[PDB]
Design a binder for this molecule. Structure first.
Ligand SMILES: Cc1cc2nc3c(=O)[nH]c(=O)nc-3n(C[C@H](O)[C@H](O)[C@H](O)COP(=O)(O)O)c2cc1C
Ligand SMILES: Cc1cc2nc3c(=O)[nH]c(=O)nc-3n(C[C@H](O)[C@H](O)[C@H](O)COP(=O)(O)O)c2cc1C
Lengths: 210, 205
């Protein structure tokens, strides 16, 4: 049955570009899926803690012989995988911070890669396939082909490789040049920033409709 | 002075921790009477920057939220450790085709206007330092290999640090899973090749 996992990872608060875009997508989804319920996760406000030496390798250690930190980490993996298993659609906000994904999203994927939960512990067959993963990526500069920052995005090409074991295949709507309006010497690029946002908003408005 | 940074979560199984303690020893040889600051991001990671604690550098010191002041204190202490150093030794494992989340957060704290770069000119303030990065991959990411372009740790770090003026130099140990992983037993030669060629490059420095 139709179920939305709405994940935010922006740390910008009221200045966030990704939060309005994921709220827009989520309301567009709820209207296209009128019996659909929604689970919300804000990794921005409430990040999941880093996997540490004490809590790592829960997936290879049997339950009976885990340290109390590994069992805590395993409980976190059971929760984040369950949320994705229940979903037919996942909407993730993905800012580019220091030319990579938010640390919170990297740890969220660390928890999601869990043998027997997200992939078969024996066949290694993906267990979270046949699901929609819509990723609303925001970035401060321009990273398109024939820009000077081409190849500086290590979030957008990473996420499909980080998730590729689970059968989740992210589909990207990218808004760029979002630093242009707050950045001296980017005043010629403010029209492009507005156009990039409007194009993303169009793609979000036409999603799930004929 | 040397900053020795570990980010392994693999404990006694770690390939990177021995390689970094090797560098620390070879450095304490070539630079005797030098001090060492040790950082274990693996055991004791710096917490994620959150909505409450973010944007400390672009918010005036007076009108900062209490948690932004906490994050700024962490940034001051992190940048200090790199400023005090002449050589930086960092262990960079590849976990889920990226860096450890611990290292991504560590770089987030390090990118701080007025500490690692001038708040106004944005001129790098941590340049003219040695940054040696002992990268450890489980698989093989070389030209033609099926996982070519799946490393989002090594090609990322120079881009993430570029505002500070640190330029990482990589010694890459790959295929470290080959000898403990069935179906990759035909790559244990290259695994032993990689680790010794890496300990070789560590020795000649
Ligand atoms: C801590 C931080 C680091 C950033 N690093 C980069 C960067 O490396 N490259 C870039 O193009 N923009 C960078 N930006 C700009 C963001 O990518 C941009 O504001 C984007 O809209 C973030 O999404 P959000 O508005 O939902 O937080 C950074 C912003 C912050 C707050
Ligand atoms: C949680 C985890 C995830 C890993 N993900 C990858 C991966 O995406 N690609 C890969 O080639 N090896 C992967 N490996 C293998 C490690 O990169 C390899 O073990 C390396 O030695 C890590 O350094 P360390 O032993 O110091 O922790 C992973 C290992 C762990 C524990």
């Amino acid at each position: 049955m139709a179920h939305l996992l709405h994940i935010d990872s922006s740390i910008s608060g009221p200045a966030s570009v990704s939060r309005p875009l994921t709220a827009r997508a989520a309301a567009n989804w709820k209207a296209a899926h009128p019996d659909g319920t929604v689970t919300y996760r804000d990794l921005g406000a409430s990040p999941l803690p880093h996997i540490n030496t004490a809590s790592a390798l829960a997936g290879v250690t049997p339950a009976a012989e885990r340290r109390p930190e590994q069992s805590a980490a395993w409980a976190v993996s059971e929760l984040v995988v369950e949320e994705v298993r229940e979903a037919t659609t996942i909407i993730l906000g993905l800012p580019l911070y220091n030319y990579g994904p938010p640390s919170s999203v990297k740890a969220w994927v660390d928890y999601l890669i869990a043998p027997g939960l997200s992939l078969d512990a024996h066949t290694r067959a993906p267990l979270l396939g046949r699901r929609e993963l819509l990723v609303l990526a925001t970035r401060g500069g321009g990273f398109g082909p024939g820009t000077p920052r081409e190849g500086w995005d290590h979030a957008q090409p990473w996420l499909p490789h980080g998730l590729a074991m689970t059968g989740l295949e992210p589909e990207f709507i990218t808004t760029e040049l979002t630093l242009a309006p707050v950045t001296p010497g980017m005043e010629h690029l403010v029209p492009l920033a507005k156009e990039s946002r409007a194009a993303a908003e169009r793609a979000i408005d036409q999603r799930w409709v004929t």
